[PDB]
Design a protein around this nucleic acid. Structure first.
Ligand code: K
Ligand code: MG
Ligand code: MG
Ligand code: MG
Ligand code: MG
Ligand code: MG
Ligand code: MG
Ligand code: MG
Ligand code: MG
Ligand code: MG
Ligand code: MG
Ligand code: MG
Ligand code: MG
Ligand code: MG
Ligand code: MG
Ligand code: MG
Lengths: 99, 204, 193, 203
RNA sequence: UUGACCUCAAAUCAGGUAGGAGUACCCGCUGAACUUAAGCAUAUCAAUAAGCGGAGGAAAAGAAACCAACCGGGAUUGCCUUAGUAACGGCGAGUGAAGCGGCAAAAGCUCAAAUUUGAAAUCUGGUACCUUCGGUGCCCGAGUUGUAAUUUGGAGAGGG
RNA sequence: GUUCUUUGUAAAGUGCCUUCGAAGAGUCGAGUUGUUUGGGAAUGCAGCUCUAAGUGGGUGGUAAAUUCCAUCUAAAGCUAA
């Protein structure tokens, strides 16, 4: 990862002594927070699924991942969000009856 | 007056619409005879009053100065713990030995989660009738929660049968009330109308 | 209205610019007012030099990274190496900035070098002492100049190995240009059907 | 903690349990007046998060606001200008319904200062928001140095000038190249860039 | 054979505050047209004038969900530049900012989310007194649907 | 400037080892629509509809898929020149 020392090339720029300083407590905004994970599980067991979430789970069980992810993209904002939604739905459906 | 009209219409609408299973588990209230006994026990654990706090501080302050008391001039207290934030943390620490929550909290989001959370830590919970009596328990107007963690030796007998009675009604019944939908009441004129239909058509 | 050979102008004067014209007649009046403000601020505050100590720090933006300039405030890491806590330095007139991070030792060591020098040059008045007259100085920045580091020595002997700088320079650019293209062909050529 | 159960549940506004409550509640708010005193916050989690404290002097109001666009109030759709200005039905009133409600309660409790607001329910025709107020005359607020900045006149009618949370959101006031058009204030910014700055020694 | 809760009231109840003016500057909403294009409709005039709401001695913004892409700077605001440039535009008339660099001034921060639970420790009001922009005592009340100490991401806390 | 005041085992600051580390939703985001901007497969703002997650989110000035990295950490608040 050392700079090449020249003004052209991939790692352009001069060779300087790094430290890679100690990280900020930020960049941990997506923290684990074991108690928060617990709260999310708890609210999952009290509150069921959205009607549209249920439609996506039915799409999982009958019509397949491609159509299901497509519908997730159509409902939610981005294709990345759709991928995340279908992945968490796969986790919940696996934790469900078909253990 | 409209406020009377509105409040009556608040409850009538609340039942005619179908109530989801999660709420209306509060519709099952703790029965009459055990209710007297439960508060009869709990009234022995009323926390410090306005006056009682003053005298202990005087007898403690007038003690540490000459008796060199290291804050052990007062006995270990045994009083009901109150406060929703106080109680919720207690179950999460598994310290709540018995928790009973008022069933008439106006914003249900404050207490809807608590009985389900109590089941997961295996902490006995009671959906109890009347926040007002919860207030008089702890020298307040309203408390909405009441938790007992520690008991005297001779009173451990009381909870064990009582917890068996309470757990027999709410916590043991959790999994069936969890999938039991609420509401579904038609009106009196509607109910007589339907029965009139059933007596003519259904029973002919 | 286009006349003979004259360059195309783009003078943007078709709004009601008459209403917004700030003519700085106050340039002289403002400078004396500012010099008045600096003097009264110096007298008002304790014998402190009107400013905080600013770090020696590299400029971004390679157009300007050849130079060094003053920063806003010191990083927590640099202040710790000086032997103070971050809060205390602000009380002494040392500017601390938490947003900057140190990834350059020569910049890191340069700052702590000026930290110790500043510490050498401070007399901290005790809260309940005597506080003798200290001949207040007006500018810490004037007392602690910024020096541009020297990159090399004045003279040396050439060590030309026939490196033919273009062949270094041109092929470095060529190598980067086709870099990802090369691994792409690694995907097909190491496919092995 | 005890409020994160309220917080995490509220993320599931479309969940089965909350759908019962909001539908019940939207009926409850409809019957009452457009603006009426709220005895206690419907979302004590949200209020505390937003700065409400269970102290004397804090005031909570519920308000309902009509939804949709701002129909151009020209008579019979006659705009009297170039055709780009003929559009009447499709104007958007670039300031949020949260701001519009916040003005009305601010006018209602004219003695008082709007802290913030949050919505509690909605339907097709109306939106409902519940508004947080702070009493600068109560000695509990003039004291309590955590909050006595309210008592200063400089923030009076904070709601009307766009100094509230949604006001800043609507004014486009935030950092970045994405907001360079409106960073220090759109009108303030426009005047600075359209000013001919002349010095005595002409450059 | 009663009083506490919740909510809603009334009182020439004790005490309060809002209205209006000014408006040069300031914060927002609303918002043209003359004019230019040698016609004219997009566009320009202009995110202006007119109208409405809201403050102060300044207001606003203000301590990064910033800028950057370099060896990286580091709240905001103002000035010299960037620059009549990148870009937008019947790509016509025209419009047209931002990074860096120099300088002025400099300043940093705080709440919700942590049960204090061996002790609502918190606050308004009324009375009596005194050294009264207050303080002490006492009593009602607020408040556990949460008022104090602690924590605010640069961290920080439970422990040893 | 110095004189009545002395607070108080009351509070605070730094070092080491460990367990943690709580951080903001009809909101971000997306579609469409209107206005606006130099922002141009759409700069901002607003309306309606859909609407989240926590090794996430925004941004990285050409739409999208794939793999990374840098950079900060919104939907809460105060502040003088
Ligand atoms: K018009
Ligand atoms: Mg009166
Ligand atoms: Mg013309
Ligand atoms: Mg002409
Ligand atoms: Mg005007
Ligand atoms: Mg005035
Ligand atoms: Mg000033
Ligand atoms: Mg200001
Ligand atoms: Mg401000
Ligand atoms: Mg910060
Ligand atoms: Mg800056
Ligand atoms: Mg223009
Ligand atoms: Mg009251
Ligand atoms: Mg501390
Ligand atoms: Mg935040
Ligand atoms: Mg407009």
């Amino acid at each position: 990862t050392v700079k090449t020392g020249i003004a052209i090339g991939l790692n352009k720029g001069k060779k300087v002594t790094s430290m890679t300083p100690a990280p900020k407590i930020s960049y941990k905004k997506g923290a684990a927070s074991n108690r928060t994970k617990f709260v999310r599980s708890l609210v999952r067991e009290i509150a069921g699924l959205s009607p549209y979430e249920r439609r996506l789970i039915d799409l999982i069980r009958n019509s397949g991942e491609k159509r299901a992810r497509k519908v997730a993209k159509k409902r939610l904002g981005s294709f990345t969000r759709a991928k995340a939604k279908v992945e968490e739905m796969n986790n919940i459906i696996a934790a469900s009856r078909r253990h | 007056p409209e406020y009377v009209r509105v409040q009556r219409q608040k409850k009538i609408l609340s039942i005619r619409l179908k109530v989801p299973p999660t709420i209306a588990q509060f519709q099952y209230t703790l029965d009459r005879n055990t209710a007297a006994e439960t508060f009869k026990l709990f009234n022995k654990y009323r926390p410090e009053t306005a006056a009682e706090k003053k005298e202990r501080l005087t007898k403690e302050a007038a003690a540490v100065a000459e008796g060199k008391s290291k804050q052990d001039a007062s006995p270990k207290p045994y009083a009901v713990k109150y406060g929703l934030n106080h109680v919720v943390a207690l179950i999460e620490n598994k310290k709540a030995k018995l928790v009973l929550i008022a069933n008439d909290v106006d914003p249900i989001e404050l207490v809807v989660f608590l009985p389900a959370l109590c089941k997961k830590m295996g902490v006995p919970y009671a959906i109890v009738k009347g926040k007002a009596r919860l207030g008089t328990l702890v020298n307040q107007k309203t408390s909405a929660v009441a938790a007992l963690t520690e008991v005297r030796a001779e009173d451990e007998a009381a909870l064990a049968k009582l917890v068996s009675t309470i757990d027999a009604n709410f916590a043991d019944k959790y999994d069936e009330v969890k999938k039991h939908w609420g509401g579904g009441i038609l009106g009196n004129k509607a109910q007589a109308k339907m029965d009139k239909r059933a007596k003519n058509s259904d029973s002919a | 209205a286009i006349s003979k050979n004259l360059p195309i102008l783009k003078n943007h004067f078709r709004k009601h610019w008459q209403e917004r014209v700030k003519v700085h007649f106050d340039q002289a009046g403002k400078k004396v007012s500012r010099r008045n403000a600096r003097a009264t601020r110096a007298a008002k505050i304790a014998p402190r030099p009107l400013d905080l100590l600013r770090p020696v720090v590299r400029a971004p933006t390679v157009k300007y990274n050849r130079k060094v300039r003053a920063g806003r405030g010191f990083t927590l890491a640099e202040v710790k190496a000086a032997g103070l806590t971050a809060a205390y330095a602000r009380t002494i007139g040392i500017a601390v900035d938490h947003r900057r991070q140190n990834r350059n030792q020569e910049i890191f060591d340069a700052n702590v070098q000026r930290l110790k020098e500043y510490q050498s040059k401070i007399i901290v008045f005790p809260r309940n002492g005597k506080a003798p007259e200290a001949e207040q100085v007006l500018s810490a920045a004037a007392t602690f100049p910024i020096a541009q580091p020297a990159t090399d020595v004045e003279a040396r002997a050439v060590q030309d190995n026939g490196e033919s700088a273009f062949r270094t320079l041109r092929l470095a650019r060529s190598e980067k240009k086709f870099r990802g293209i090369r691994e792409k062909r690694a995907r097909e050529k190491a496919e092995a059907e | 903690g005890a409020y994160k159960y309220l917080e995490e549940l509220q993320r599931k506004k479309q969940s089965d349990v909350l759908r019962f409550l909001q539908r019940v509640r939207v009926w409850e708010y409809r019957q009452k007046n457009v603006i009426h005193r709220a005895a206690r916050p419907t979302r004590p989690d949200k209020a505390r998060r937003l700065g409400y404290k269970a102290k004397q002097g804090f005031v909570i109001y519920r308000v309902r606001v009509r939804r949709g666009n701002r129909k151009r109030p020209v008579p019979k759709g006659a705009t009297y200008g170039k055709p780009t200005n003929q559009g009447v039905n499709e104007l958007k009133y670039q300031r949020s319904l949260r701001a519009t409600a916040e003005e009305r309660v601010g006018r209602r409790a004219a003695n008082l200062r709007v802290l913030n607001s949050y919505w509690v329910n909605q339907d097709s025709t109306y939106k409902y928001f519940e508004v947080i107020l702070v009493d600068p005359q109560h000695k509990a607020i003039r004291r309590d140095a955590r909050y006595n900045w309210i008592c200063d006149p400089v923030h009076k009618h904070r709601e009307a000038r766009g100094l509230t949370a949604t006001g800043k959101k609507s004014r486009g006031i935030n950092k970045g190249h994405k907001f360079n058009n409106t960073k220090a204030g759109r009108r303030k910014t426009w005047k600075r860039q359209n000013t001919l700055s002349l010095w005595r020694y002409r450059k």
